[PDB]
């Protein structure tokens, strides 16, 4: 059966400014089937009340989802996205870099 590995990007809605309210985004795309686990992490710990977009797909039938949470970035706080999917032999962790 078709299994496509997710692409992952982690990024902020607005250019990061320490102490200024923002959104942390984890965009997962290009995957099949649609069953997927996405957590946003703050200093390695799961963020609660994370929201996501309504399940949609591209013209090649591959799924995409945006996971997001309101956050205030600081110098020292580390953010990441952790993804589990049938195509991944272990969880994929992508760290937030405010320059990407």
């Amino acid at each position: 059966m078709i299994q496509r590995t997710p692409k992952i990007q982690v990024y902020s809605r607005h250019p990061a400014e320490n102490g200024k309210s923002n959104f942390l985004n984890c965009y997962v795309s290009g995957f099949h089937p649609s069953d997927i686990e996405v957590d946003l992490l703050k200093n390695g710990e799961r963020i609660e009340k994370v929201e996501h977009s309504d399940l949609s797909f591209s013209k090649d039938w591959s799924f995409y989802l945006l996971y997001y949470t309101e956050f205030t970035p600081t110098e020292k706080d580390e953010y990441a996205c952790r993804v589990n999917h049938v195509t991944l032999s272990q969880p994929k962790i992508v760290k937030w870099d405010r320059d990407m």
Binding site: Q9, N25, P33, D54, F57, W61
Partner: protein
């Protein structure tokens, strides 16, 4: 301008855990405007763009009844397709549906779409003539003969030439500047030393709509195709999009590099520099 409307349905079976989950989303161009989720506490069509909120209760009521009926139809289709393919009744399978219309600036239909995928493979599609089917295999030919006998293509064509075109025109009237007027990117270049001898120039496009954009790095006005890292266009979360392009350059040669931005919302193509 030219515009599109699309509905995207996903049904996923979960044998032993109850009826398949059905999710629908609707788009005008790159703007999501409705959703339905069969697993919601009280499933109903919900607005996801401000300009659809002015549609009256008869709209939301009618559409909600349609999604509830389509969820049951998809459940029957999933049972029929695992039979056609002689698959285990224990396994989870996916049925996706994608349909809608492309119109020109005058609002006339340019193209209709109505097609399906099973477990991520094309299954059956309504042809551009809106009168005939393309079936992927002998299973999809069972569906094709059933749909030929039931005059399904005529039901789909009536929708695509009628309600699809007429309702897209209405949404464009109610969505006004949000759907008709492109939002140009906010642009800037950042500089990231790698070493004493190499640095990254990154060209940012933020807050643009629609998603279609071109970012290119040039050295002395020649495209640097083979040397540019380009990320896939990504949603900001506020209905706009983001993209960046990066090039690694020799330290002290940054001034030879320009970023070129093409977007429908720009009065003219932008040339940017580290400044």
């Amino acid at each position: 301008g030219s515009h599109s409307m699309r509905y995207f349905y996903t049904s996923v079976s979960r044998p032993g855990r109850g009826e398949p989950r059905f999710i629908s989303v609707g788009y005008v161009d790159d703007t999501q405007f409705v959703r339905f989720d069969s697993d919601a506490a009280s499933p109903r069509e919900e607005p996801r763009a401000p300009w659809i909120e002015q549609e009256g209760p008869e709209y939301w009521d009618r559409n909600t009844q349609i999604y509830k009926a389509q969820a049951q139809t998809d459940r029957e289709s999933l049972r029929n397709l695992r039979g056609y393919y002689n698959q285990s009744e224990a396994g989870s399978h996916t049925l996706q549906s994608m349909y809608g219309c492309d119109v020109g600036p005058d609002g006339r239909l340019l193209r209709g779409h109505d097609q399906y995928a099973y477990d991520g493979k094309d299954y059956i599609a309504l042809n551009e003539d809106l009168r005939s089917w393309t079936a992927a295999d002998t299973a999809a030919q069972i569906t094709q003969r059933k749909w030929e006998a039931a005059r399904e293509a005529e039901q789909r064509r009536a929708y695509l030439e009628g309600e699809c075109v007429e309702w897209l025109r209405r949404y464009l009237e109610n969505g006004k500047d949000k759907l008709e007027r492109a939002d140009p990117p906010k642009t800037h270049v950042t500089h990231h030393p790698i070493s004493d001898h190499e640095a990254t120039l990154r060209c940012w496009a933020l807050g643009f709509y629609p998603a279609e954009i071109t970012l290119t790095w040039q050295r002395d006005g020649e495209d640097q195709t083979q040397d540019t890292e380009l990320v896939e266009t990504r949603p900001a979360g506020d209905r706009t999009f983001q993209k960046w392009a990066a090039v690694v350059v020799p330290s002290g040669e940054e001034q030879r590099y320009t970023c070129h931005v093409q977007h429908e919302g720009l009065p003219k193509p932008l040339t940017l520099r580290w400044e």
